[PDB]
């Protein structure tokens, strides 16, 4: 069984995406169907669901409206109209046979899925603010600084520290994506607390898709 | 209608997992169909167990006999059992069923097989810095790093009150030493910020709880 999802990509809020779902390996015609999609880091919800013969149609309460479900029989393809799309709309996008059998039913087989971002960006430089000490911390002589990089898009972000001459104990965490479209990111130092009155800390803030660049003190 | 599953469980090879799930009560888990599907890091969802009863079950394709269901009408609960944890086994698992045709999920159960030594999370909270706080804005970021398994909860709470919205909230990434790290972000206004005496990050590993706080003066 194969099912191939293809027809995703970046699209702005208020714009429309049509996902499309090849299928073999079964008699496609004689089944249903059914959506699925996952936002990044969260559990699976179900978006919509067409009968074997196309007749009936089903729309969670989030999409209803919005979406329209489609089969084309005689092509084997699955189809998802997405219309208004929305910040919440974001997310991997499964296929999956939806069967009838006598006394069940069940999600037997997924495709792999296609990504759907919806940024109301399309290339936005980062803001980038100190984190500064704050406290001792103590842990003898242990102190932890960093940078936070705010709202850029589209990834990614490096960081360094002191041009390169600061690696141990760096520690760049992987980026968040809010619902408003834009990453943020944070990279912390843990540094000796003696050396916080001698020391100078720069992080190297590079953000290739823009052409920005920031050294943040 | 709610499918309640626990956020995450750790065994260790060759021992036997027990994954619940709680249906509310509109609906009477002795009439329902079970649907567990596993998803691997990084894949699609694959159908891993349909239950019903005893009598009336069946396997999803390449799932070995080491696993099966069971029904607990009391607490009107849905069990998924393997036992000889195997390395292969360690996965999100989703409980579904069908309601009146709406196809309802629970929220994934993180089961790690242990591979490594425990190690409880190293949690540091960051304020918002003057410059943030002088553009009327507000970030606080919650550092989370050096745990496993590599799965936590992260709630906020604003002088000693959850806090509702406002919070993203990474998935854990594996890190260098093959321990995993996660980050929390808590977006106000600066006037949001002044309002309270204390912002709290609190984070959850395997039902022991860290609270760190911050203070705005």
């Known amino acids: 069984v194969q099912l191939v999802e293809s027809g995703g990509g970046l699209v702005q809020p208020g714009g429309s995406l049509r996902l499309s779902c090849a299928a073999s390996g079964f008699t496609f015609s004689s089944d249903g169907m059914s959506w699925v999609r996952q936002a990044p880091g969260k559990g699976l919800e179900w978006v919509s669901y067409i009968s074997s013969g196309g007749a009936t149609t089903y729309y969670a309460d989030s999409v209803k409206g919005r979406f329209t479900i489609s089969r084309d029989n005689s092509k084997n393809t699955l189809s998802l109209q997405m219309n208004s799309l929305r910040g919440e709309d974001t997310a991997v996008y499964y296929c999956?046979?939806?069967?009838?059998?006598?006394?069940?039913?069940?999600?037997?087989?997924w495709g792999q899925g296609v990504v759907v971002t919806v940024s109301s960006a399309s290339t936005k430089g980062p803001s980038v603010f100190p984190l500064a000490p704050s406290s001792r911390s103590t842990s003898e002589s242990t102190a932890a600084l960093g940078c936070l990089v705010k709202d850029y898009f589209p990834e990614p972000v490096t960081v360094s520290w002191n041009s390169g001459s600061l690696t141990s104990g760096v520690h760049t965490f992987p980026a968040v994506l809010q619902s408003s479209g834009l990453y943020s990111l944070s990279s912390v130092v843990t540094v000796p607390s003696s050396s916080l009155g001698t020391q100078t800390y720069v992080c190297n803030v590079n953000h290739k898709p823009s052409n920005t660049k920031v050294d943040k003190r | 209608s709610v499918l309640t599953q626990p956020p995450s469980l750790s065994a260790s090879p060759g021992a036997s997992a027990r994954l619940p799930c709680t249906l509310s009560?509109?609906?009477?888990?002795?009439?329902?169909?079970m649907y567990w599907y596993q998803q691997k890091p990084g894949s699609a969802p694959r159908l891993f167990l349909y239950?019903?009863?005893?009598?009336?079950?069946?396997?999803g394709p390449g799932v070995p006999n080491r696993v099966s269901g069971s029904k607990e009408t009391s607490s009107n609960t849905a069990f998924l059992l393997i036992s000889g944890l195997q390395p292969e086994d360690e996965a999100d698992y989703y409980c579904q069923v069908y309601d009146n045709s709406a196809r309802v999920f629970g929220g994934g159960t993180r089961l790690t097989v242990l591979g490594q030594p425990k190690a409880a999370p190293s949690v540091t909270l960051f304020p918002p810095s003057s410059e943030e706080l002088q553009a009327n804005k507000a970030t606080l970021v919650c550092l989370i790093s050096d745990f496993y398994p590599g799965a936590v909860e992260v709630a906020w709470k604003a002088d000693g009150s959850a806090v509702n919205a406002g919070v993203e909230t990474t998935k854990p990434s594996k890190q260098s030493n093959n321990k995993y790290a996660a980050s929390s972000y808590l977006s106000l206004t600066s006037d949001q910020w002044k309002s309270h005496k204390s912002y709290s990050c609190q984070v959850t590993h395997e039902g022991s709880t860290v609270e760190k706080t911050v203070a705005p003066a």
């Open positions: 239950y019903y009863s005893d009598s009336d079950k069946q396997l």
């Open positions: 999956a046979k939806d069967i009838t059998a006598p006394g069940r039913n069940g999600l037997d087989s």
């Open positions: 009560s509109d609906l009477n888990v002795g009439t329902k169909n």
